[PDB]
Each structure stands twice: as C-alpha cells, then as structure tokens.
Amino acid sequence: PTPKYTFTERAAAGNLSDAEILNSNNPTGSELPDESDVVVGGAGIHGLIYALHASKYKPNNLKISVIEKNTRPGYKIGESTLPIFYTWCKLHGISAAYLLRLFGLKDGLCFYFLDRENQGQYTDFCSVGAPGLVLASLQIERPMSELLFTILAQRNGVNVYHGREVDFKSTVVQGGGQGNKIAVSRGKYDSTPKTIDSALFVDATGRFRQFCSKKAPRHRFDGWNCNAFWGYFTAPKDESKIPFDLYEGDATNHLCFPEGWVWVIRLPSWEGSPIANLMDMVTYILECADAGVPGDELPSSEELARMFGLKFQWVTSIGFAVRNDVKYPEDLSAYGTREAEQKFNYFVQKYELLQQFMSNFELIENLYGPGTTWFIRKTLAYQSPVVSGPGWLAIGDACGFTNPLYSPGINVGMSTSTWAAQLSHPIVEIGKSAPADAAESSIRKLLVPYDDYCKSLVPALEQMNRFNYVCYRDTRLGPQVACLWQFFAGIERYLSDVNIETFAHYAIKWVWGAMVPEYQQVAQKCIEHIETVPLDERLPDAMVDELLAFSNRIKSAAVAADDFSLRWDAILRSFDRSLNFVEGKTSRDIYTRQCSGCGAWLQLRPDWKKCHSCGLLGTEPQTAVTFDPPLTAEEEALLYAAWNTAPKYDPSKELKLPTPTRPA
Numbered sequence: 001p002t003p004k005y006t007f008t009e010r011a012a013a014g015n016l017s018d019a020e021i022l023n024s025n026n027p028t029g030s031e032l033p034d035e036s037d038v039v040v041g042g043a044g045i046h047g048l049i050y051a052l053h054a055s056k057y058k059p060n061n062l063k064i065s066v067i068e069k070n071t072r073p074g075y076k077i078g079e080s081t082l083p084i085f086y087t088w089c090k091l092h093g094i095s096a097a098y099l100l101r102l103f104g105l106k107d108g109l110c111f112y113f114l115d116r117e118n119q120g121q122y123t124d125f126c127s128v129g130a131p132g133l134v135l136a137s138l139q140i141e142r143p144m145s146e147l148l149f150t151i152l153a154q155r156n157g158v159n160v161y162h163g164r165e166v167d168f169k170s171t172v173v174q175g176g177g178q179g180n181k182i183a184v185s186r187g188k189y190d191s192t193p194k195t196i197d198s199a200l201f202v203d204a205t206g207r208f209r210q211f212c213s214k215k216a217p218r219h220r221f222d223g224w225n226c227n228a229f230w231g232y233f234t235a236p237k238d239e240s241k242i243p244f245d246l247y248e249g250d251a252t253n254h255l256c257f258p259e260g261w262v263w264v265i266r267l268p269s270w271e272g273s274p275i276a277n278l279m280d281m282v283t284y285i286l287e288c289a290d291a292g293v294p295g296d297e298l299p300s301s302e303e304l305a306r307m308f309g310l311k312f313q314w315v316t317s318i319g320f321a322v323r324n325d326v327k328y329p330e331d332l333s334a335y336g337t338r339e340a341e342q343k344f345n346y347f348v349q350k351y352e353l354l355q356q357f358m359s360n361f362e363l364i365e366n367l368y369g370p371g372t373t374w375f376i377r378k379t380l381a382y383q384s385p386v387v388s389g390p391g392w393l394a395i396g397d398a399c400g401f402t403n404p405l406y407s408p409g410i411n412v413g414m415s416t417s418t419w420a421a422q423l424s425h426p427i428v429e430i431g432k433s434a435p436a437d438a439a440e441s442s443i444r445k446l447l448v449p450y451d452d453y454c455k456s457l458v459p460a461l462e463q464m465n466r467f468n469y470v471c472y473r474d475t476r477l478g479p480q481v482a483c484l485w486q487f488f489a490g491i492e493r494y495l496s497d498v499n500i501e502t503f504a505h506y507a508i509k510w511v512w513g514a515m516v517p518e519y520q521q522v523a524q525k526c527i528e529h530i531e532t533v534p535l536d537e538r539l540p541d542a543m544v545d546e547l548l549a550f551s552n553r554i555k556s557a558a559v560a561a562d563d564f565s566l567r568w569d570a571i572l573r574s575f576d577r578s579l580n581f582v583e584g585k586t587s588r589d590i591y592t593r594q595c596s597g598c599g600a601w602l603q604l605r606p607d608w609k610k611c612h613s614c615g616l617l618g619t620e621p622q623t624a625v626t627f628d629p630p631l632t633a634e635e636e637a638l639l640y641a642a643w644n645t646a647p648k649y650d651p652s653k654e655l656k657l658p659t660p661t662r663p664a
C-alpha cells in the first residue's frame with residue numbers, strides 16, 4: 001500500500017483542533033448523533049475494547065457511540081499486556097508484525113527478590129514468553145493503544161467522539177426501550193449540550209466510576225492498601241551493567257521486597273507527535289495489516305516516524321507499588337520537592353540493589369506534558385458494589401481494581417469488557433421486542449451472572465495481590481511459592497483454541513488462576529501466617545520453611561492432576577519438567593534478541609530478518625530460536641501449526657478451560 005496523508009492534510013487545510021481531526025474519521029459524522037443503541041462513557045482501553053468486541057461479535061446490529069472527555073487519547077498508567085490481550089488483537093485482525101511497530105516487545109515475567117536485612121543478596125524467578133511464530137506480548141503506550149483502537153473502531157462502524165464529556169448530572173438512565181437520554185457537552189462551561197437518545201449506557205469511566213458511584217458507595221477491602229509513585233526514564237541500549245544476573249529488558253521486570261515491588265517496562269513513546277500525523281500512520285499500518293504485508297517489507301518504527309513526521313523514542317516506565325502501612329520519615333525534602341519524587345528517591349536509597357539498578361537510567365522530564373515527571377496515586381484497590389441496572393452496566397476499572405502486579409487491570413479486566421459487549425446485543429433486542437416490565441425483568445436475570453462474576457472477581461484478585469505481596473517478604477517464598485503458584489494456576493491452557501465467539505467465556509474462566517482451589521489454599525496459609533509478623537520484622541526462618549513445605553506438598557498433587565502437556569523446564573529457568581525447584585538451573589528457551597543497532601528487543605523467526613524498530617538487517621539469528629531441551633524439526637513445525645489461525649466457531653465443541661485439570 002502507498003502511504004496516504006489524509007488526516008495530516010485535512011487538519012492543515014481546515015486548521016482543525018485535535019478533537020476535530022479525530023472526530024472527522026467517524027462513520028456517522030464529526031457531530032454527535034441524535035440517537036444510538038449504545039452510548040459508552042469513556043474511551044479508555046476498556047471502552048474501546050467493549051465497542052470493538054461488540055461490533056466484531058455481531059456486526060451491523062448495534063449503533064455505538066463512545067464519548068471521551070480527552071481531546072486526544074490521553075496518558076494512562078497501565079502498559080503491560082499478556083497473551084490473552086494479544087490473542088484478542090490477533091482475533092480482531094492485527095497480529096504481531098504490525099503491533100510491534102507501535103508497541104514494545106514483551107518476553108516473560110521476571111522477578112528479583114531483594115533481601116532487606118542482607119543488602120545486596122537477591123534471588124530471582126525467570127520466565128520466557130513464546131516463539132515469534134507462536135505469539136507475542138506487548139508493552140503499550142496508552143495514548144497509542146487508545147488511538148489504535150479508536151481508528152479501528154471508526155473503521156468498523158463505531159463512532160468515537162473525543163473532546164466530549166458525558167454530563168452525569170443531567171443524563172437520564174432508565175429502563176424501557178430507548179429510555180436513556182445521555183447529555184454530552186464539551187465541559188462544565190458548555191451551555192449547549194447535546195442529547196443522545198439511546199437504549200444502553202456503558203460506564204467505562206474507569207476508577208472515576210462516574211455513573212455507578214451514584215448507585216453504591218465505593219467499597220474498600222480490609223487490611224492495608226497500596227500506593228504507587230512512578231516516572232519515566234531512558235532505556236539503555238547496553239543492559240550489561242544492570243546489577244541482576246541474566247537480566248533482559250523485554251521482560252516485565254519486578255524488583256520485589258518486603259514493602260512492595262518496582263515495575264520496569266521498556267516501551268517506545270510517540271510523545272511529541274501531532275495527532276493527525278499519528279492517525280495517518282495508524283491508518284497506514286491497518287491497511288498493511290489488511291493486505292497482509294510481510295514483516296520484512298513493512299517499514300520499521302523509525303521509518304514510520306520519518307514517513308509521517310512523528311517523534312519516536314525508547315523509554316523505561318519505572319514505578320513503586322508499596323503497602324500503605326509503610327512508615328516514612330516526616331521530612332523527605334532531601335529527596336525532592338514533590339511527594340511522588342520524594343518517596344520514589346527515598347525508596348531507591350533504602351535498597352542498594354535498587355540504587356545500583358536505577359543508576360543505569362536517566363530521568364526524563366515531563367514526558368507527557370508539564371507536571372508529568374512524577375506521578376503518585378494512593379489507595380489503589382477498590383470495588384464497585386453495583387455494576388449494572390435498568391439501562392446501564394459498567395466495565396473495566398469502573399467495576400473495580402486491585403494492583404498493577406501481574407497486570408490484571410487490562411488483561412483480566414477485559415473479561416468484563418468483552419462479556420458486556422456480547423451481552424449488549426440481546427440486552428438491546430430485548431428492550432426493542434418486549435413491553436417494558438418484562439424486558440426489564442429479563443435483562444436483569446440475564447445480567448445476574450455478570451453481576452455475580454464481578455462481585456467475586458475483585459476479592460479474588462485482592463487475595464491474589466496479598467498472596468504475592470506477603471511472599472515478597474522472603475527471597476524463597478517469592479519465587480518458589482507465589483510466582484510458582486501464579487504461573488501454574490494462571491497459565492492460559494488451550495488459548496490457541498479461542499476465537500471471537502468463545503473469547504468472553506474463556507476470559508471469565510481465567511482470572512489469572514486466582515479462583516483455582518489449591519491456589520487459594522496456599523494463598524490463605526501464607527497470608528494467615530505472614531500478616532501476623534510486623535512489616536518492619538524479618539520472617540522467622542521456621543515460618544518460611546513451613547510455608548514452603550506446605551506449598552510444595554499441595555503443588556505436587558495439583559501438578560500431577562493437570563493433564564496439560566507443557567515443557568515447564570523450558571519456560572521457567574529455575575524449575576524442572578515437574579515444576580520442582582532446581583537450585584542452579586540456568587537452561588531455558590530463547591525467543592528474543594536485542595538489535596545491535598538500536599537496542600530494541602526482537603522476536604526470533606526466519607521470516608523477520610530485519611529489526612522491526614530501526615530496519616537494521618540481522619545476520620542469521622532468526623531461525624536461531626533456542627529450544628532447551630531441544631525440539632525436533634517435526635515438533636517445532638507442530639508447535640507453529642497450532643498457533644497459525646484460530647479455529648472457526650463450532651457451537652457443538654465445549655470450551656476447554658485455561659485452569660488446571662481438577663483431580664478425580
């Protein structure tokens with residue numbers, strides 16, 4: 001495809017604002033419709049996942065308008081995504097060769113556990129992702145992901161309006177047919193608001209809970225909560241001076257310690273680029289995806305920046321997520337002038353490994369505009385007690401949220417977004433096909449499982465978060481209990497069978513494995529023990545011994561009961577095939593390499609000879625995926641064949657679950 005500069009030129013010819021050039025790409029028009037079937041409040045990632053999945057699940061059935069207050073896709077924390085997310089993107093027609101032009105490659109979840117009382121001592125837990133010919137995971141800049149999904153939505157019959165705000169004071173939401181009158185303005189100052197007559201309202205306003213807060217107070221869990229403070233840093237090409245052995249920048253790296261943990265996410269940033277130019281680059285990428293342009297014939301990230309007049313740079317997202325029962329010194333003025341900066345730099349110098357780590361990175365000033373050098377957010381975890389009612393439902397963060405750890409926010413949260421999307425078709429048709437009272441009762445009954453799923457989802461994720469946190473207080477419990485159990489319970493078994501039709505059903509059965517009985521059994525034993533030890537104390541060695549022996553005993557039976565075949569010793573560096581811990585083991589599969597030219601991490605596959613980020617040609621390490629233990633040529637071919645194309649929908653086949661097989 002020849003690149004087109006439609007939006008860049010349209011913006012220039014009409015002198016269009018950011019919101020006007022975006023809204024000009026809508027199928028219905030740049031102005032709001034008088035009427036819609038569904039109105040979505042918020043074009044965060046979940047508002048857009050919802051609209052995309054509803055449209056893809058059953059096209060040409062629902063008119064959908066998404067309303068977003070930001071004038072262009074805005075900054076969001078929440079950058080790490082998981083195989084179920086990539087699978088969703090691929091099912092929606094965008095595979096890795098195209099996504100990697102926009103987003104950073106992710107390979108593995110890797111953990112380093114710092115001993116607090118023995119400074120400098122650490123252990124690790126290392127995992128890999130998948131071969132390039134199997135799948136990829138992604139580190140996403142959220143202004144870019146929300147732009148991508150906005151453009152994809154507009155190309156699939158969804159209208160998205162930026163720079164427009166739902167007025168939750170004058171909006172009317174009720175049962176009936178199209179009983180909703182959604183008031184939409186440009187802000188508080190706007191005396192000429194519009195009304196969209198509609199049947200269903202979707203609260204996708206995230207943690208702001210702008211609608212469902214009206215129906216129930218925000219719920220907090222017992223015990224400590226967490227705070228986060230973070231910033232953005234350079235991304236070094238030469239990672240060899242990082243103080244952790246066998247470190248790789250394309251993992252989501254976790255630096256873990258008694259008070260909490262640090263995330264480290266390497267990703268490209270398009271900040272500084274005009275929005276119209278970005279629309280043209282994204283549109284070009286989608287045209288290339290439609291045409292099936294091979295990876296080596298697709299322009300690299302840096303070439304796209306030159307073609308469309310963009311800014312491109314590599315950054316590292318680095319943040320603390322720590323318990324809110326941590327005691328700080330009263331005066332932290334020596335570490336900065338802002339609270340977020342003060343606590344970040346204070347915590348770094350509390351651990352020599354964190355200070356040695358951070359000394360590989362240079363702070364970026366105001367990457368996302370003025371005041372964005374440092375971020376802080378306090379009291380992270382919450383739940384919405386009510387997530388649906390006559391005329392409305394809620395998705396994503398608007399239902400609740402726990403913690404950045406293991407990235408449930410996007411990857412588990414999309415279970416609500418995609419299930420709500422599927423349910424939206426019968427919800428709207430019920431209201432169009434039955435009188436008001438029966439329609440409302442039928443819709444309420446239909447959403448009882450959605451309500452019940454959401455009600456139990458956040459507490460299970462909250463227990464999952466506490467399980468990992470308490471084990472991060474010890475360098476043996478962290479990797480050998482918490483990490484092990486999250487990987488065994490939560491690995492996405494039979495993901496290669498998922499399609500658009502089964503996606504929501506599969507996703508709601510995943511829950512990162514946090515509903516698995518043996519997982520909850522081990523989690524409750526550790527939490528019950530460790531929460532009795534004050535945070536400023538070291539865990540007694542006998543407590544660690546006992547919890548480790550308990551976890552391993554439950555593990556061996558649960559692993560023996562699982563019928564899913566998996567080269568566990570290839571995926572986890574520290575474990576054998578039967579998921580037993582091996583003290584000195586270093587063997588694992590190798591799926592990625594760093595470009596010697598630009599430092600970007602690349603997937604190894606024989607048809608990708610050139611770096612997807614800068615275009616530099618590599619010399620024969622692409623077929624050099626290392627399988628350890630080895631695979632035959634036939635076994636390797638069989639692996640890639642299973643992940644080529646998702647199977648067609650078969651209404652007779654029963655869904656195979658991601659969780660371990662139950663015992664007899």
Ligand SMILES: Cc1cc2nc3c(=O)[nH]c(=O)nc-3n(C[C@H](O)[C@H](O)[C@H](O)COP(=O)(O)OP(=O)(O)OC[C@H]3O[C@@H](n4cnc5c(N)ncnc54)[C@H](O)[C@@H]3O)c2cc1C
Nearest residue numbers: 042044045046069078080166205206396397404407409410
């Ligand atoms: C420190 C931290 C780290 C995290 N790390 C990760 C991670 O690594 N991986 C991961 O998967 N998750 C992570 N999360 C969770 C993740 O950030 C969220 O789950 C995710 O951004 C939720 O998306 P959403 O679409 O529900 O809401 P948001 O993305 O917050 O979007 C809500 C939207 O609603 C709009 N809006 C609000 N009011 C109105 C109105 N009246 N009218 C119109 N629009 C409105 C806002 O402008 C906003 O765009 C993290 C969270 C935190 C706090």
Ligand SMILES: *n1c2c(c3ccc(Cl)cc31)C[C@@]13CN4CCC[C@]4(C[C@H]1C2(C)C)C(=O)N3
Nearest residue numbers: 419449453504505508509651652653654655
């Ligand atoms: N259970 C079923 C279905 C479904 C959808 C979403 C959730 Cl959260 C739970 C859930 C829809 C099914 C799937 N099966 C395929 C073969 C037979 C059925 C039975 C249904 C059940 C009840 C398992 C089917 O036709 N639809």
Ligand SMILES: CC1(C)c2[nH]c3cc(Cl)ccc3c2C[C@@]23CN4CCC[C@]4(C[C@@H]12)C(=O)N3
Nearest residue numbers: 083109127128129130131134487491492571
């Ligand atoms: C199941 C997947 C998505 C997975 N899910 C994880 C979760 C955690 Cl927490 C850690 C590692 C993984 C992996 C690595 C896997 C293991 N599978 C072997 C055959 C195909 C596949 C798919 C992939 C593979 O190549 N790599």
Ligand SMILES: [Cl-]
Nearest residue numbers: 080252406407
């Ligand atoms: Cl993650």
Ligand SMILES: [Zn+2]
Nearest residue numbers: 595598611614
């Ligand atoms: Zn390169």
